[PDB]
RNA sequence: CUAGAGUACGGUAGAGGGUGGUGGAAUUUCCUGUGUAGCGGUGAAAUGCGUAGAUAUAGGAAGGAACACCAGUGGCGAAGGCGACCACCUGGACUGAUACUGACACUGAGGUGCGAAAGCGUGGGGAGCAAACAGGAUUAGAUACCCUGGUAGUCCACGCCGUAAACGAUGUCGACUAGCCGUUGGGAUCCUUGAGAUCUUAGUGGCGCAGCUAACGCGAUAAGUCGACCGCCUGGGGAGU
């Protein structure tokens, strides 16, 4: 419970991420997990090359879902070429919105 | 990494920057594999020398 | 896997591979047909492949290798023993009848999978084209031509790894260690072949090989010069000639590949 | 053939110094080593040999121009900085000096210790 | 007293649960090459040094900070 | 063991007290944890460091059962037959 | 009866374990482009690798293990031991208030487990390192120290092995005995800005009085003062044979 999944997609696929966010969150809602934030940090340059690219599109997301949606998202990112990196996390607390993008601009 | 403005100033800034960043003593510590016993020897000896210095300086601070 | 007590001289080193997941007899009769035992003899009657003879009566299983049925989910009924293979076979049941035998993956005990196209890319046993799978996956039963059927990695415990994809070919590393390019539209099955414990086995006695169908093999040094190139001599001769096949082919370390048609499809030789 | 704004690579071991002049594509143009200057011994490891090799490499590089250089120093041995002072003496504008060094985070274990 | 004020730092404010997102704060504790600075230079408490190292490593995995000047 | 699972055992084997001190509660909690941990070590066979904790709980349970036998036999039997031990 | 011991409730810190996935520096192998005479190595040399285009340099592919900096007399674990990040289960220790069990405790001959490293059995894996082994040099001689190669092994799954300077050369548990200076993490009082101050626990370090010691030297983490239990020693070789 109370995950903070962060994943970044290919720069060429940044246009399609709007539908992908809903495509992933619909399964979480079907499982029964509410989503507390959905932030798109935008296009930024990487600190190093990941499969010979330098841009990406970070997508921040925090979820409170059972073990089934966790496994669903653990498998969906693996079998995708758009998603190049991911990091599932765990926090024993709630979620507040608008963390740092206001300061990052 | 050092950019450029006389050349001697750049040379000295490169030499000092490399020493401050490291990557010159570490290379010298990559030419022979010290066993973890020898590595714990460094940790014991440096700790003894650093803790002893903190007490020896107090004698000067009397 | 079990071990036999030395009750008799023949049981001292018998290592059996027992399983309780196999069904107790009664195979699906419609998918069985008779097979005669060749004995290593072609239509001329001459022995071509020697060291074959005897054995036990067996029925050939119509094992499905194409998996042409796409989209229809399938449910496993049971896993059965296949006399003419080292791996186990699983009996399927699609949404409307049409029971089939396939090479059982490591998935067992009434699993459900859909041999289809781009559907269900996760579970092992799913057959799909080689183009739409992630690199680095382990596959088995790889066909070399479209519609021919699975050819490579069908024995027990065998598999192959995906390593690259470019153009119409998808390179993969075989279990032998030989890199090979295969066409992208060729189907393959995710996972590993079931009976990985086959390598841990000891037949135990001389008679254990005779009901496998293999006839005893006789060395060349125990023959006369007329029979074998190694020939006879006085005492236990040291095989004074170089090691050689009965028909005069070098045995210890001589290449014998002369295809010269499919060499372009091989990236790296096994070494 | 004319190329400008090359990259100078310096590989300085404990027994030799190798100087190579390249471009942004990393294509070799002129290379010189301390052993080729004719030292072959304890004199080979001195930083003066790195200066002789560096200035010899800086003479064949003028065949293609290269009025601007980028220096990449590499290795712990002597002549790490002495070779750099032998570059601009030949009349090259050195834009930047960069430390490139293989530093394993854990890496393979190195050889055994001498006795 | 530059090392002394840095323990405050993290300790004076209610920022105990730091995050791997605040690059503006993380960059102050990373040297020019990219390696993370020690604790005796910044003077931060050992608890917050360990908490800050994990955040630096997470930001490194997310390619938000570099490892070395090589790339 | 979850908080609610502890609370359910406490409410079940409460000795008309409203408190969690008695051996009937302690042995019950230890037995519930021991039964739960059985499936963990069938998956993780080499987890020897966590194996040490289970033996500590088993020894504490056997000590508490001996103490309970040292005071009353009816209470000892009513717990052994109810938890399925010995 | 609650002072020992244990249970219930919050909250911390952790390279504490096991099952999977994913990272980037570096080494080696292979392919390709540029380029040309050495490279490598040593007290100094040689063996070796080189115009069959090496070393160096740039682009790409595969694979194995270790996890810079953080990093500390730092932390956890009964010990051995444990350093990349993430998910999964999972043990114990720590600090606070309240409620309860009401001696339920300590030790422990036999026995039952956990065992660094090496080693062995079956199956995989093969980057580096390196027993054995080959060559070169030094050497009266050199099986060695030095250099170039290099197999088992070092890695993974299951099983066996019971040994180490397995060290704090100090068995476990409980209580009293001047102080000073650090540090790990947890709470209290405190003017309130603190780079804050004092006390108190659970660890981890440096000095030090009384006491002990043959002396070195321990000295609230005693080798001081006392209690419970266990193990062990009786001159050196012979012989842990
Ligand atoms: Mg029939
Ligand atoms: Mg034969
Ligand atoms: Mg034979
Ligand atoms: Mg004969
Ligand atoms: Mg005869
Ligand atoms: Mg003949
Ligand atoms: Mg002993
Ligand atoms: Mg001893």
From Swiss-Prot, chain A:
The keyword DNA damage does not apply. One of its GO terms (biological process) is translation. Keywords: Ribonucleoprotein, Ribosomal protein, RNA-binding, rRNA-binding. The keyword Ribosomal protein applies. It comes from the Bacteria. One of its GO terms (cellular component) is cytosolic small ribosomal subunit. One of its GO terms (molecular function) is small ribosomal subunit rRNA binding. Signal peptide: none annotated. Transmembrane segments: none annotated. Belongs to the bacterial ribosomal protein bS6 family. Binds together with bS18 to 16S ribosomal RNA. This is Small ribosomal subunit protein bS6. The chain holds residues 2 to 106 of 139 of the full protein.
From Swiss-Prot, chain B:
Residues 43-62 are annotated as: Disordered. The keyword Ribonucleoprotein applies. One of its GO terms (molecular function) is structural constituent of ribosome. Residues 43-54 have a biased composition (Basic residues). Keywords: Ribonucleoprotein, Ribosomal protein. GO terms for biological process: translation. Residues 55-62 have a biased composition (Basic and acidic residues). GO terms for cellular component: ribonucleoprotein complex; ribosome. The keyword Ribosomal protein applies. PANTHER family: MITOCHONDRIAL 28S RIBOSOMAL PROTEIN S21, SMALL RIBOSOMAL SUBUNIT PROTEIN BS21. NCBIfam families: S21p. Belongs to the bacterial ribosomal protein bS21 family. HAMAP family: Ribosomal_bS21. This is Small ribosomal subunit protein bS21. The gene is rpsU.
Swiss-Prot record, chain D:
Transmembrane segments: none annotated. SUPFAM superfamilies: Translational machinery components (SSF53137). Pfam families: Ribosomal_S11. Gene3D superfamilies: Ribosomal protein S11 (3.30.420.80). Keywords: Ribonucleoprotein, Ribosomal protein, RNA-binding, rRNA-binding. One of its GO terms (cellular component) is cytosolic small ribosomal subunit. GO terms for biological process: translation. GO terms for molecular function: rRNA binding; structural constituent of ribosome. Belongs to the universal ribosomal protein uS11 family. Part of the 30S ribosomal subunit. Interacts with proteins S7 and S18. Binds to IF-3. Located on the platform of the 30S subunit, it bridges several disparate RNA helices of the 16S rRNA. Forms part of the Shine-Dalgarno cleft in the 70S ribosome. This is Small ribosomal subunit protein uS11. It comes from Pseudomonas aeruginosa (strain ATCC 15692 / DSM 22644 / CIP 104116 / JCM 14847 / LMG 12228 / 1C / PRS 101 / PAO1). The lineage of its organism: Bacteria, Pseudomonadati, Pseudomonadota, Gammaproteobacteria, Pseudomonadales. The gene is rpsK.
Swiss-Prot record, chain E:
GO terms for cellular component: cytosolic small ribosomal subunit. Gene3D superfamilies: Ribosomal protein S18 (4.10.640.10). PROSITE patterns: RIBOSOMAL_S18. GO terms for molecular function: small ribosomal subunit rRNA binding; structural constituent of ribosome. Keywords: Ribonucleoprotein, Ribosomal protein, RNA-binding, rRNA-binding. GO terms for biological process: translation. InterPro entries: Ribosomal_bS18, Ribosomal_bS18_CS, Ribosomal_bS18_sf. Belongs to the bacterial ribosomal protein bS18 family. Part of the 30S ribosomal subunit. Forms a tight heterodimer with protein bS6. HAMAP family: Ribosomal_bS18. Binds as a heterodimer with protein bS6 to the central domain of the 16S rRNA, where it helps stabilize the platform of the 30S subunit. PANTHER family: 30S RIBOSOMAL PROTEIN S18, SMALL RIBOSOMAL SUBUNIT PROTEIN BS18M. This is Small ribosomal subunit protein bS18. It comes from Pseudomonas aeruginosa (strain ATCC 15692 / DSM 22644 / CIP 104116 / JCM 14847 / LMG 12228 / 1C / PRS 101 / PAO1).
């Amino acid at each position: 419970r109370h995950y903070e999944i962060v994943f970044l997609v290919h720069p060429d696929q940044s246009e399609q991420v709007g539908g992908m966010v809903e495509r992933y969150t619909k399964a979480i809602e079907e499982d029964g997990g509410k989503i507390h934030r959905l932030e798109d940090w935008g296009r930024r340059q990487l600190a190093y090359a990941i499969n010979n690219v330098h841009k990406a599109h970070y997508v921040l997301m925090n979820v409170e879902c059972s073990a089934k949606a966790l496994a669903e998202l653990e498998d969906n990112f693996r079998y995708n070429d758009a998603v190049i990196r991911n990091l599932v996390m765990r926090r024993d607390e709630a979620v507040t919105e608008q963390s740092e993008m206001l300061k990052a601009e | 990494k050092v950019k450029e403005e006389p050349f001697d100033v750049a040379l000295r800034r490169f030499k000092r920057s490399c020493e401050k960043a490291g990557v010159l003593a570490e290379v010298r510590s990559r030419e022979f594999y010290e066993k973890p016993t020898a590595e714990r020897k460094r940790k014991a000896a440096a700790a003894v020398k650093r803790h002893a210095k903190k007490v020896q300086r107090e004698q000067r601070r009397r | 896997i079990v071990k036999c007590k030395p009750t008799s001289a023949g049981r001292r080193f018998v290592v059996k591979v027992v399983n309780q997941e196999l069904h107790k007899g009664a195979p699906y009769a419609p998918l069985l047909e008779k097979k005669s035992k060749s004995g290593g003899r072609n239509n001329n009657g001459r022995i071509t492949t020697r060291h074959i003879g005897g054995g036990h009566k067996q029925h050939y299983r119509l094992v499905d290798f194409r998996r042409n049925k796409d989209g229809i989910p399938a449910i496993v009924e049971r896993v059965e023993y296949d006399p003419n293979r080292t791996a186990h076979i699983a009996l399927l049941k699609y949404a409307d009848g049409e029971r089939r035998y396939i090479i059982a993956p490591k998935g067992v005990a009434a699993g459900d999978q859909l041999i289809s196209g781009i559907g269900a890319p996760i579970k092992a046993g799913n057959s799909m084209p080689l183009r739409n799978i992630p690199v680095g996956s382990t596959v088995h039963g790889i066909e070399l031509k479209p519609g021919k059927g699975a050819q490579i990695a069908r024995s027990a415990g065998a598999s192959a790894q995906l390593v690259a994809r470019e153009g119409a070919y998808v390179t993969l590393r075989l279990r032998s260690g030989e890199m090979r390019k295969v066409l992208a539209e060729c189907r393959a099955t995710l996972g590993e072949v079931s009976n990985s414990e086959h390598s841990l086995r000891s037949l135990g006695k001389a008679g254990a090989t005779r009901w496998r169908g293999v006839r005893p093999t006789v060395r060349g040094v125990a023959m006369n010069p007329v029979d074998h190139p190694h020939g006879g001599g006085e005492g236990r001769t040291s095989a004074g000639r170089h090691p050689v096949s009965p028909w005069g082919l070098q045995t210890k370390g001589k290449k014998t590949r002369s295809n010269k048609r499919t060499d372009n499809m091989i990236v790296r030789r096994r070494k | 053939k004319t190329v400008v704004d090359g990259i100078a690579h310096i590989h300085a071991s404990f027994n030799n110094t190798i100087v190579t002049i390249t471009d942004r594509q990393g294509n070799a143009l002129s290379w010189a080593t301390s052993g080729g200057s004719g030292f072959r011994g304890s004199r080979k490891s001195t930083p003066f040999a790195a200066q002789v090799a560096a200035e010899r490499a800086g003479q064949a590089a003028l065949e293609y121009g290269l009025k601007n250089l980028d220096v990449n120093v590499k290795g712990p041995g002597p002549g790490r900085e002495s070779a750099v002072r032998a570059l601009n003496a030949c009349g090259y504008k050195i834009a930047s000096i960069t430390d490139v060094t293989p530093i394993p985070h854990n890496g393979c274990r190195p050889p055994k210790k001498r006795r | 007293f530059f090392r002394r004020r840095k323990f405050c730092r993290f300790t004076a404010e209610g920022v105990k649960e730091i995050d791997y997102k605040d690059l503006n704060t993380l960059k102050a504790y990373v040297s020019e090459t990219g390696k993370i600075v020690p604790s005796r230079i910044t003077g931060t408490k050992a608890k917050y040094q360990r908490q800050l190292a994990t955040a630096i490593k997470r930001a490194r995995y997310l390619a938000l900070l570099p490892y070395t000047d090589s790339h | 063991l979850s908080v609610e699972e502890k609370a359910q055992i406490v409410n079940e084997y409460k000795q008309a007290e409203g408190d969690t001190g008695s051996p009937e509660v302690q042995v019950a909690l230890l037995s519930a944890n021991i039964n739960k941990l059985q499936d963990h070590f069938k998956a993780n066979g080499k987890d020897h460091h966590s194996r040490r904790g289970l033996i500590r709980m088993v020894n504490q349970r056997r000590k508490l059962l001996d103490y309970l036998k040292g005071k009353d036999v009816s209470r000892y039997t009513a717990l052994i037959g109810r938890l399925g031990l010995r």
